Structures are given as structure tokens and as C-alpha cells.
Amino acid sequence: QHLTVATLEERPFVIVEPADPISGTCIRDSVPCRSQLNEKRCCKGFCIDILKRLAHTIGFSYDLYLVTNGKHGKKIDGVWNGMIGEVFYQRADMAIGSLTINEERSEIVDFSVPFVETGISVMVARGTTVSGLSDRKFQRPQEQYPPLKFGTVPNGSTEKNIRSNYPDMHSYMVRYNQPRVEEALTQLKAGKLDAFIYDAAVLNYMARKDEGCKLVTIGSGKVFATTGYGIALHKGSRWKRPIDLALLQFLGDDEIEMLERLWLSGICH
Ligand SMILES: CCCc1cnn(O)c1[C@@H](N)C(=O)O
């Protein structure tokens, strides 16, 4: 069969590039992907490598598109956007990327088994002195004269988690919302942020490849639950079982571990 697949750029899980200007095609290991709004684009990365393996193992063809209506998935006044919205409203058969499994989402779409471990971590400059996410600097923040400056990228599972588990801290953080990881790290490297709270799998990767190894993460410890990325599918989808079996097979064949090495490794430790 042929599946429609929604995705979203977040390096290095999904990396988007123009087609090779010489051949006009997607060269190397990249695959064609178009925009939801619709210039030819190509996608590659850890999740794209997973997607290629699923299509070959299970035997489906697919067209892949980039979501423009929001990002991962947020429910605003009864309506979902992002990758979750695409699957929920049956515009796509599945969505794959750095898509975190949570309770709110699982209520409305099915997820595959998780294939990347994630959660919530905090990034700080290697210099900054702060304990972790238990710290009062984070929790009770207007309690300091020049308060700690820390933010996240809003509208994802991280912000949902914080606003739900730590409502007081959330109303403070909102001032320090960032549009993308790229901007957050820039602000963090410049003192405009003291800390950046974000998806663990992505943040841990950013630290591992930070130029000069000047940025480090601290783990949430007990402050936040461990979770995973999963492929989103229609509630009741016939595709969940075969996708699961394939993923479980990759996970024990050492194919996922290989992909981890390929995509997610860095020089800093
Ligand atoms: C644009 C938000 C990105 C983000 C922040 N936290 N988490 O978990 C995500 C994303 N992985 C998600 O699934 O919402």
C-alpha cells in the first residue's frame, strides 16, 4: 500500500535540505519531502532512516511532507495542530520525527512502541552554578532579585509537562520562551538565558556536539518522567502492529543502536 507521512524538521532526527542544484534530485541518503503549504526539498536523519527501513521491511511506499500547521502537536480550544493534528484529522496515515509520547496525545492517536528514549533535561553553560531542576532558582523564581533566566520552546510536551506539574514556575518561564533550539542556544551562549529546559534526546545531542564543549545538560532526576519518541498513527490503525514488530526487530537486531551511533554521537562528554 501507499502511506502519507507527516514529519517536521528537528536535527538530527529530521534534517531538511534543498535538492542538489546540479542533478535537481535528492542525492546521498536523503528522500524527497514536500511542504504542507505545497522549491523541492530533501529530508534525512535518524527518523528518516527508521522510515526507510519500515517501508522496506513492511513493504509500503510513501510520500513524506513537512508540517507547517504548528509543530509537534498542541491542542488549542478543542482543535489539534502539528503532526498530531495531521494524524488525528486523518490527513496523514502516520507521523514520524522527534514526537514525544504523552497521555494527552495517546488518548486520541495510537503510538508505535517507543524507539528513542527521551524526557526533559536542562542545559546550562558549563560555568553556571545551579543544582538541577529541584533548585529553588527554578521553582521559586521571583524570590531572587535578579531572577534566574530560563525558558523552553513552547507548545510541545515539555511545556505541557511543566505547566501541569509546576504551574508557578511555568508562568515565570513564559517570558523566556524561545522559537527554536537554535535561538535558545544562541541566547544561552550570550548570557540572555541562564538555562534551557527541553526534550532530553535533542538537548543531550546538542551538548555532545557543542563547539568547544561549553554547554552541558543536567538530568531531571525525579523532577520529570522518562518517556520516548513514537510514531503516531490513526486511533485503531492497522499499521501499528506491523510497525511495532519491525521496530522491535530493529531494536534487537542492533539496527537502532547503529543508527544512534550514526546520527546522535558527538565529541563532547
Ligand atoms: C516545539 C516543541 C518541541 C518540544 C519540546 N518538548 N518536546 O517534547 C517537544 C517535542 N518533542 C514534542 O513532542 O512536543
Swiss-Prot record:
Gene: Grin2d
Organism of this sequence: Rattus norvegicus
Protein name, per record: Glutamate receptor ionotropic, NMDA 2D
Stated role: Component of N-methyl-D-aspartate (NMDA) receptors (NMDARs) that function as heterotetrameric, ligand-gated cation channels with high calcium permeability and voltage-dependent block by Mg(2+). Participates in synaptic plasticity for learning and memory formation. Channel activation requires binding of the neurotransmitter L-glutamate to the GluN2 subunit, glycine or D-serine binding to the GluN1 subunit, plus membrane depolarization to eliminate channel inhibition by Mg(2+). NMDARs mediate simultaneously the potasium efflux and the influx of calcium and sodium.
Domain of life, source organism: Eukaryota
Subunit relationships: Heterotetramer. Forms heterotetrameric channels composed of two GluN1/zeta subunits (GRIN1), and two identical GluN2/epsilon subunits (GRIN2A, GRIN2B, GRIN2C or GRIN2D) or GluN3 subunits (GRIN3A or GRIN3B) (in vitro). In vivo, the subunit composition may depend on the expression levels of the different subunits. Interacts with PDZ domains of PATJ and DLG4.
Record family assignment: Belongs to the glutamate-gated ion channel (TC 1.A.10.1) family. NR2D/GRIN2D subfamily.
Extracellular topological intervals: 129-269
Tissue: Expressed in brain, mainly in the subcortical region.
